[PDB]
Design an enzyme around this catalytic site. Structure first.
Site, PDB file in Angstrom:
ATOM      1  N   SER A   1       0.799  -1.220   0.000  1.00  0.00           N
ATOM      2  CA  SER A   1       0.000   0.000   0.000  1.00  0.00           C
ATOM      3  C   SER A   1       0.835   1.274   0.000  1.00  0.00           C
ATOM      4  CB  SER A   1      -0.949   0.011   1.200  1.00  0.00           C
ATOM      5  OG  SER A   1      -1.958  -0.977   1.061  1.00  0.00           O
TER       6      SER A   1
ATOM      7  N   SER B   1      -6.194   2.952   3.232  1.00  0.00           N
ATOM      8  CA  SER B   1      -5.533   2.032   2.308  1.00  0.00           C
ATOM      9  C   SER B   1      -6.559   1.179   1.564  1.00  0.00           C
ATOM     10  CB  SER B   1      -4.528   1.149   3.046  1.00  0.00           C
ATOM     11  OG  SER B   1      -3.682   1.923   3.877  1.00  0.00           O
TER      12      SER B   1
ATOM     13  N   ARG C   1       4.724  -0.358  13.349  1.00  0.00           N
ATOM     14  CA  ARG C   1       5.325   0.367  12.233  1.00  0.00           C
ATOM     15  C   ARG C   1       5.520   1.838  12.578  1.00  0.00           C
ATOM     16  NH1 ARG C   1       1.032  -1.106   7.714  1.00  0.00           N
ATOM     17  NH2 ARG C   1      -0.219  -0.387   9.499  1.00  0.00           N
TER      18      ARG C   1
END
Ligand SMILES: O=C(O)c1cccc(-c2nccs2)c1
Ligand SMILES: [Cl-]
Lengths: 242, 242
Positions: free
Chosen positions: B47, B95, B227
């Site tokens: 993505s 996304s 992340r």
């Protein structure tokens, strides 16, 4: 298409304050305020005028882009963040009056006047110094008028280039998280009574946009933080932000 | 020009994971990483590819602007936020793969391949299905290559209109406050081993910009929060953000 919600007055009274918050639901084309009359009372825009001033400087080439550096003129001033180089983004972030007073001088009397008429901005009256009329001149604008102007800006409907409007909307970025985005500008009118504080802008949600414009009596700079805090309390009450 | 601080591996090993963080100081033209080999190892963009895909869609007129509504196809998918109408902003935020698959099909193989070469984007190989090559096709990109691409996007130096790049950078907005602005995009690659999570973008300061590109092992969706969590802790540790 306008409702008066006087319960919001508590948020002003909890802080021994006085002022108005005006909200506009773009989807529903519907307005909300605690005081319709103050919502239509026109004041000096003060540093909220940095929005139209930016648009005009950019569209005329006074400002090349958002990275152009405007060197401090070496004159130490009592706001430390003003005594340094700035670009359009930091100039707006820190409400650097002297940088925008240079913009206005280069814009000029005639072009500034013509542009504010094109913008349908407040009373369209720049009487006073070309580089201070928004702080102590004849220009006046109400909270509902601030929203009208902002709605055109958001929709790229002002008679300036799309580019100029995108750049200013970027410079207006104030806060963003996973729940909303606020593009807004503060203002603080002190040279002419009544001393007031401004906060105008809009809240971007996934599925709507809530334009807002608030002003409040500001006898001292001590209460400046209430411009954002009171607006957020209303936004939280109306379940617009968590 | 580059510096490897293997100490930073603790940011990943303290969560029983392995990954790479790559930081680039724009002002000093200096890069930093925990792992030079993995910083130049190429993975499926997943993505994060929505950055170049949005650019191409906008510049070819497949997407008119960030307000155009891409209607839900009425096919229930397992991600609740995908079962909604979207625009470029919200499709980036969530996304929304199927919206960008339709972009790719309209872009077409030839124009897509040719723009990715123009962008110098990764291995520039769109082998596979035009509507999924960034998920299970042949295209690959490394963390350092992500940074090389983002830096051009920041400086409006990619071979698309300034407008297209400004719009995509608006849609990249992730976080903004009084200290920093983050524009970034998450990625999550599961169809080819090893499964990894991406986060690429930059953090804007008053006086500098720091580009970042990170990927990390992601055996399950449980750890996707790492992340951004890991990245920000590196940024705090390096005193790029408070
Ligand atoms: O809120 C504003 O737009 C603004 C603009 C200029 C100065 C100030 C001052 N802040 C503190 C003391 S004078 C505030
Ligand atoms: Cl933005």
């Amino acid at each position: 298409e306008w409702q008066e919600n006087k319960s919001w007055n508590a948020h002003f009274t909890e802080h021994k304050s006085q002022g108005v918050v005006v909200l506009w639901n773009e989807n529903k084309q519907q307005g909300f305020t605690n005081n319709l009359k103050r919502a239509n009372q026109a004041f000096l825009p003060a540093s909220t005028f940095k929005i139209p001033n930016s648009l005009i400087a950019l569209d005329l080439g006074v400002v090349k882009d958002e990275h152009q550096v405007f060197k401090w003129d070496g004159q130490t001033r009592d706001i430390a963040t003003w005594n340094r180089d700035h670009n359009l983004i930091t100039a707006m972030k820190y409400s650097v009056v002297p940088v925008y007073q240079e913009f206005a001088r280069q814009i000029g009397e005639a072009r500034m006047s013509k542009m504010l008429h094109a913008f349908d901005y407040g009373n369209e009256d720049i009487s006073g110094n070309v580089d201070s009329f928004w702080l102590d001149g004849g220009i006046r604008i109400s909270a509902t008028e601030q929203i009208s102007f902002l709605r055109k800006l958001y929709h790229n409907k002002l008679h300036v280039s799309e580019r100029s409007q995108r750049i200013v909307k970027q410079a207006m970025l104030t806060e963003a998280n996973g729940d909303y985005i606020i593009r807004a500008k503060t203002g603080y009118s002190t040279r002419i009574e009544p001393k007031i504080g401004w906060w105008v802008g809009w809240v971007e949600l996934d599925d709507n946009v809530w334009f807002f414009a608030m002003n409040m009596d500001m006898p001292t700079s001590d209460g400046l933080g209430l411009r954002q805090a009171i607006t957020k309390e209303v936004l939280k009450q109306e379940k617009i932000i968590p």
